[PDB]
């Protein structure tokens, strides 16, 4: 007898829902709500209203292209009074002549995204099923049961709802606060953000699983950040640091994330040119804030102090920059060991390189501080941005030419002020906690410059970076080994040999002597009458960001003047002195002249002239007459001068 209900219309209650879900800017036309929290829909029936004793109403929701109940992307649930906490439910909260106001709740771990809501109404022996509408479901920092819950309203306002903020740039000494329009609730931005998820490589690999995993703010943070500068062509931005941004738009121009996002969408999800670290970070903040994950942009500063090999290596994309920016997002970490909930570092700057679909993060900030580098995801990459260990061997010594991890900064909550969060990444220098973390992060290595034989002006010779690994672990390092001439007063001249090794493998409990050949032809023209060559080595281990420097000055010695004493040493009479020198160069010597003197042996300075040039390796001798007189020691003294080999000295004691 009872006939089926006829829905006239469903009122999405955008106004009360927007307000209560903190989604009002997003609900001007469509319904956007947050998980784990009741929202309202008001049904209007044509004719007869719902009667619980006759009518059975059942709701169905699906999200994604392959919804399933086991995946959590499909749910079916009846309209009824009993409300099971933590489930998809619908209950009556008001009933008037023609209207039925319902309260629907979603699980606090439901997948986020666009859902289609359908209703089946059944009266007795008949049923009818149809589409009520759609809603977008987001993460809920207000819901205690949600992984992204933040216990503080002022922080929820800052990190989810506030659409403008500050990105710090400049330097550690001169911090710049650049205002930024994140614009997460601007028209079209949420749709663009859902698009970004639906073109991510994990969605292409398995869209049903991808949409299911969108329950997790770990998963969505990883994908969201990871997609901003994505090795695949569908990422949001392309990086560039060569001051040459004419293809497109300069990183320094942008004052917001919105225009970039809209550009990206409009050009077939093709990367927008160009980003730099803070532009990637800024767009990541927009995306993640849109989806409901509390997020904040952070800047770390690094500082040099200036001939250093270390600063050369870098000067002339895991560099160490004047500043670097990433984001932090707030969430629990049930996928990790207990106690890692809270801020998680996400770094959307280009190179996904070691392993995995994305880099870098999320990694708990506490894991970084604690040097617990086995914690997923990509902990070494974030550790390396705020730590660098640099040691000199001039011969063991700490080198502060490079200080990384200074004045780590983010906008203060509810204020236009800078909050220093360095303490969150780094224990104080020299503290037991710092040293204990440094121990956990690297679980014996040494370097010095060796030669192994005499070094002679005119010769080609090898120098060696002698690297010792006295630990149980393998190391893969980059090595820079080079030589430059140097003056007695410490002025570095031109290069006379260089060797770069991208891939030096150091086996456990082993050593290597890595040679570099120093050629006469390379140091000859550019070398001081000091005869000095500075050899410098830099061993880099980019994973932990550790640096070993070795430096040694070498003296290229002059040829010896042989001085021979013909005749007797008796305290009296005639005596002849034979002095010689072998040309050590591979080239002939022009304008050779010996000058000789020595009171007690001679009374005239004897200067010999050698017109016949001394060929390479040829020795030249000259004999000259002495005449002693008294008991004891006399020192004959010799100068040899040339066009290519000046002021070489010698002496001999006689009697």
């Amino acid at each position: 007898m009872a006939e089926e209900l006829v829905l006239e219309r469903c009122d999405l209650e955008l106004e009360t829902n927007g307000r209560d879900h903190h989604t009002a800017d997003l609900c001007r036309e469509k319904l956007v709500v947050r998980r784990g929290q009741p929202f309202w829909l008001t049904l209007h029936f044509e004719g007869r209203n719902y009667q619980a004793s006759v009518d059975s109403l059942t709701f169905s929701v699906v999200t994604g292209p392959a919804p399933s109940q086991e995946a959590g992307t499909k749910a079916r649930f009846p309209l009824r009074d009993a409300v099971e906490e933590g489930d998809w439910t619908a209950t009556v909260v008001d009933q008037q002549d023609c209207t039925l106001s319902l309260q629907l709740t979603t699980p606090a771990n439901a997948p986020i995204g666009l859902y289609r809501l359908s209703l089946e109404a059944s009266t007795g022996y008949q049923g009818s099923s149809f589409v009520l509408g759609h809603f977008i479901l987001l993460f809920n920092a207000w819901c205690p049961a949600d992984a992204v819950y933040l216990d503080s309203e002022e922080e929820r306002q800052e990190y989810v709802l506030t659409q403008q903020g500050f990105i710090y740039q400049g330097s550690a000494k001169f911090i710049k606060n650049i205002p930024w329009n994140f614009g997460q609730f601007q028209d079209g931005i949420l749709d663009i953000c859902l698009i970004l998820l639906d073109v991510n490589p994990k969605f292409l690999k398995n869209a049903g699983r991808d949409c299911s995993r969108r329950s997790s703010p770990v998963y969505v943070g990883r994908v969201g950040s990871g997609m901003v500068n994505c090795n695949d062509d569908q990422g949001v931005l392309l990086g560039r640091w060569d001051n040459n941004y004419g293809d497109g738009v300069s990183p320094m121009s942008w004052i917001g994330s919105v225009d970039i996002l809209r550009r990206w969408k409009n050009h077939g999800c093709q990367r927008v040119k160009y980003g730099q670290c803070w532009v990637f970070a800024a767009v990541a903040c927009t995306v993640l804030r849109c989806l409901g994950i509390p997020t904040r942009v952070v800047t770390n500063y690094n500082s040099a102090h200036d001939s250093n090999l270390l600063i050369e290596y870098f000067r002339n994309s895991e560099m160490i920059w004047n500043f670097h920016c990433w984001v932090e997002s707030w969430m629990t970490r049930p996928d990790l060991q207990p106690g890692y909930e809270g801020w998680q570092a996400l770094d959307p700057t280009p190179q996904e390189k070691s392993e995995g679909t994305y880099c870098c993060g999320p990694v708990p900030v506490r894991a970084i501080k604690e040097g617990d580098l086995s914690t997923k995801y990509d902990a070494p990459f974030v550790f390396a941005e705020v730590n660098a260990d640099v040691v000199d061997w001039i011969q063991k010594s700490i080198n502060r030419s490079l200080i990384v991890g200074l004045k780590i900064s983010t906008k203060s909550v509810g204020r236009d002020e800078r909050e220093d969060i360095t303490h969150t990444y780094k224990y104080p220098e020299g503290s037991s906690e710092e040293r204990e973390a440094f121990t956990r992060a690297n679980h014996g290595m040494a370097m010095r410059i060796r030669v192994g034989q005499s070094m002679n002006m005119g010769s080609d010779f090898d120098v060696f970076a002698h690297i010792t690994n006295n630990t149980a672990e393998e190391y893969v390092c980059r090595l820079l080994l080079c030589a430059r001439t140097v003056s007695y007063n410490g002025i570095l001249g031109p290069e006379c040999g260089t060797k770069y090794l991208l891939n030096l493998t150091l086996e456990p409990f082993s050593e290597k002597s890595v040679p570099l050949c120093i050629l006469y032809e390379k140091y000859r023209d550019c070398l001081t009458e000091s005869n000095l060559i500075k050899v410098r080595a830099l061993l880099v281990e980019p994973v932990i960001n550790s640096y070993l420097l070795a430096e040694r000055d070498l003296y290229l010695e002059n040829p010896e003047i042989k001085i021979r004493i013909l005749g007797e040493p008796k305290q009296k009479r005639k005596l002849v002195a034979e002095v010689s020198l072998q040309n050590p160069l591979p080239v002939a010597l022009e304008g050779c002249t010996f000058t000789v003197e020595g009171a007690g042996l001679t009374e005239e300075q004897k200067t010999v002239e050698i017109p016949d040039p001394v060929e390479a390796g040829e020795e030249v001798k000259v004999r000259m007459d002495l005449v002693p007189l008294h008991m004891g020691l006399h020192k004959l003294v010799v100068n040899f001068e040339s066009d290519k080999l000046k002021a070489v000295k010698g002496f001999r004691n006689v009697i």
Binding site: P251, Q276, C277, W278, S303, A304, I311, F314, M319, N322
Partner: peptide
Amino acid sequence: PXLPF
């Protein structure tokens, strides 16, 4: 812009 430290 971003420059080496």
